[PDB]
Design a protein around this nucleic acid. Sequence first.
RNA 1: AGGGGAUCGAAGACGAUCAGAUACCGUCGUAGUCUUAACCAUAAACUAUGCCGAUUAGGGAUCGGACGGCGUUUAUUUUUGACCCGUUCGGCACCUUACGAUAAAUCAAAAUGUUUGGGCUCCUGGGGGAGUAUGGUCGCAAGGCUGAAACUUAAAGAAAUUG
Lengths: 216, 104, 208, 86, 128, 129, 21
Amino acid sequence: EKEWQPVTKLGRLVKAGKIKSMEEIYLHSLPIKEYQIVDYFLPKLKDEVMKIKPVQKQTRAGQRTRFKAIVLIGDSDGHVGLGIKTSKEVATAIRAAIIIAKLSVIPVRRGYWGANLGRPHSLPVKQSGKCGSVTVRLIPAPRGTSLVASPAVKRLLQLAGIEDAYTSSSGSTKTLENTLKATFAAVANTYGFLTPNLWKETKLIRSPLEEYADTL
Amino acid sequence: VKKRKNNGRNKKGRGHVKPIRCSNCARCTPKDKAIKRFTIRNMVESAAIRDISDASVFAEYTVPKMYLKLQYCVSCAIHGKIVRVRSREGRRNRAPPPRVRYNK
Amino acid sequence: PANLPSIFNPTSADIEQLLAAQCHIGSKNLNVHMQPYVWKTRADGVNIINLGKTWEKLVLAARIIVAIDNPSDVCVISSRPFGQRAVLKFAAHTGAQAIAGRFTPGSFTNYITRSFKEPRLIVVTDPRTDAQAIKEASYVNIPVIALCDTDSPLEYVDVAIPTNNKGRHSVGLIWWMLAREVLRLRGTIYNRETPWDVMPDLYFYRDP
Amino acid sequence: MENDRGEIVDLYVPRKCSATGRIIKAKDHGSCQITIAKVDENGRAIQGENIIYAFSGFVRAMGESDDALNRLAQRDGLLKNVWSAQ
Amino acid sequence: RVRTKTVKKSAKVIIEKYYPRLTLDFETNKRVCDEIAVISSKRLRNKIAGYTTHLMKRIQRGPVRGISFKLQEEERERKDQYVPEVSALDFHQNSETGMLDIDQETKDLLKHLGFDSIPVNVIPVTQS
Amino acid sequence: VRTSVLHDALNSINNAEKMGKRQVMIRPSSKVIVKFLQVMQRHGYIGEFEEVDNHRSGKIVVQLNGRLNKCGVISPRYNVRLAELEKWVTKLLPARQFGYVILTTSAGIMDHEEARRKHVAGKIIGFFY
Amino acid sequence: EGEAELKDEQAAEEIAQTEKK
RNA sequence: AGGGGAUCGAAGACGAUCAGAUACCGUCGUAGUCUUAACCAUAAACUAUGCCGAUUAGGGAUCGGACGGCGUUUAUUUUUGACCCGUUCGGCACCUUACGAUAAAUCAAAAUGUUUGGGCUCCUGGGGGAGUAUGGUCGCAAGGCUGAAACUUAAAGAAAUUG
Ligand SMILES: [Mg+2]
Ligand SMILES: [Mg+2]
Ligand SMILES: [Mg+2]
Ligand SMILES: [Mg+2]
Ligand SMILES: [Mg+2]
Ligand SMILES: [Mg+2]
Ligand SMILES: [Mg+2]
Ligand SMILES: [Mg+2]
Ligand SMILES: [Mg+2]
Ligand SMILES: [Mg+2]
Ligand SMILES: [Mg+2]
Ligand SMILES: [Mg+2]
Ligand SMILES: [Mg+2]
Ligand SMILES: [Mg+2]
Ligand SMILES: [Mg+2]
Ligand SMILES: [Mg+2]
Ligand SMILES: [Mg+2]
Ligand SMILES: [Mg+2]
Ligand SMILES: [Zn+2]
């Protein structure tokens, strides 16, 4: 409720306003372990729960029931993530799920189909990912078409900021947890593809942690 | 599923091998599959050596040994407690057990 | 010599101590990645390390340490008994924390454990016996410096110093020379020519 | 970097591994930076002057980072006769 | 007759906080404990006193791991500055001659590095 | 038996690059192999290559500099008109902006973009991006 | 069967927000 | 169809066991088990993994051939042979590891596949009915190869987790 005490060195620097934006963290690829960092840089992040499914376990007296919740978040402007956590109580699981989702927020790369006229709307290349017998493929599309996909993966692409795309699915897509995790991996790899316009050499600079001095 | 990589047989590089007779139930099993134990023992048990020793006519005497090679089928091997069930990870360990050399 | 002068040569005195401490004796097993740091294999015996490359890599490792802003961000690790005392003395002379004995896994990953540290660099006596320290370093982006023998895993080991890594005298001497270089690049020793006033046997091990 | 009328539109420009040239992704833990100080004529370490290298997680796991640094360090005149091609 | 963690944990802290104030005698240690501790049971106090007097009996002959007190602690870092007058690495004073023993291909390394003037004795090594 | 020397060269290049190496060796060398490398070189995807000359067939040693994702070969060399050339770029090219499809025509082998300029068609032999 | 508390949650947004007649 | 027929032993006859015991256990015992001259063509005929070619990672053992080397052993003795150290070509296997692959167990191939094309042959399409009916063909016979339909059903099955 009241003001938080940073526990890691990165958290202290964020509280003092010594770093510009979250992309500075992304550039040096530093781990994030405190959910107050993300919402300090990215307000108006929407959250929306997918579904809850019970899970059983057999014991001598009877069967033990727990509840599993799936939650994904995004800002519709290039940031998205999801988290899954199970607990003995429905309400408790949802609260913990939102925290895990914030910790995993990642940026997306959005490009053009053909000619460029500002405000990129689609994926730069075609990318795909696999998570346990489910494969999802994304294809760039011309401006004007909407998102062509199942309701499950259309929501995730909506919150990532991607506007136009083509989709293809394989395997047992009825496993909702596996499908979302495969889509999340495909979008995450957009910045991992080396297009010719990125061939230019970059200058290496020291990380914020090394060149700043923290408080006691 | 395969329970063992070698099929519990130890036969790779050939097609057939002649069987043998089990030493307990007289069953037929391939020679490479049987459990083989080689044993060296004395003619008489350790309590009886003194009685033979002083009843001899050759001053000091050394009782001879006896050499046997017993070999069993697997069904009779683990009922006589020659070998016993191991865990999933402990199955893949073919080093002979370390015989006790101190005996408390 | 675009970025180092000629005053960094080993000199006859420093070498004289190295082969007197059996720092040029390796094991029979030879890793493929350690082939560059091999002079010759002994006839009917072990490999022999190249001391010239030992000095060259030792200076380079020292230059990385000085670049750290505050000395308290450097962490030095040892588990085997032969390296307990040398690590602690290294921590006292310079600025550094020392971890001797058990590592308490979760130190670099869990933020509620008692021994929680956030270092910028890790120095390890032996990669094989300190695998837990190296393994956790791969999770949170820390470069690793380690002392290595002829046979040693080199996963997640950016800088390697070829040394005996198992001798009683060899382990202590290398830690001593590394400490001397760190102070030399700073203003503490004030000169390359002047000798240090601490005796090499201080960085050794005692049975009781 | 992308453009529409000469202005950048990418959210950020990632860095590249020095040994292989692969793009170092975000959340790619296990990728490190190496900073080596610069010494002056009399042997002291100059403060604020250093040489920076970057290695990706993929090359570190293979165990090739030690040899990769030797090639780069010798190229920048930091070492003598320690790395070579057979 | 095994003492639980409450007895053992409480005995550990008493010894290190107040080492000299209590001794090998059980009767005296009984009166030491109740003054410097808050115990709600007489039987619990007796058991705590029984264990702590047992611990120091074995302390009298060599220290034991898991126990640290100021007199034991302060003595340790007094011993850790031990250093001889002649270095073990130094060999000019040692041996009947200053020069030491190496094998053949080590000397070739010295020639390659340029330190030919080092006085050494070379002995061949081969078994085959 | 060896039925496509071009496939062996392209496959060997792809394996070494995927593992992060810098140089490759190719055992058989042919005219089609060299003409394929030259197209890649002019776009910066590779560096220098050298042809050692044994008296049998020669070898090639190519120098890699990253920048290369995949280089494959189409084994049945289909016949492609000029009007249907846009079907292929939709199939086996990651994006419209970059990437090249290699053809063989009566005017020499060339990428799919230069063939449009010269208004020529032929047979398809491979691709790289 | 986690449908007991959806009437008055207001701490999360469901996929198909159940419209009431 | 002849020769041979020690030992084991389908069928068969008895003794026990059992509520029953045409079985497990015990004593006998025919065809068969072996060989010569002709038929049969099926096996969990198994690595449940077709054949040719290229590339991709570390390690120590072992069988066959060649090449290099310090010694020991030994002979009408040298060169050879036995043992020791290293390199290399071709084999039956094994240990570690995952950058990779798979639903998983696990795999140096089951890798180089949504970023999908090196060449070639055979086989499979929910579970039963059914490898059954019928026609043809091969065989002395037992049988082999080829091989349906009517009708019926919402689940059979694989790998792993807790009881
Ligand atoms: Mg064979
Ligand atoms: Mg067979
Ligand atoms: Mg007749
Ligand atoms: Mg007959
Ligand atoms: Mg009989
Ligand atoms: Mg009968
Ligand atoms: Mg069959
Ligand atoms: Mg079969
Ligand atoms: Mg191998
Ligand atoms: Mg060997
Ligand atoms: Mg041989
Ligand atoms: Mg020879
Ligand atoms: Mg071999
Ligand atoms: Mg073989
Ligand atoms: Mg398709
Ligand atoms: Mg029929
Ligand atoms: Mg029903
Ligand atoms: Mg099962
Ligand atoms: Zn038996």
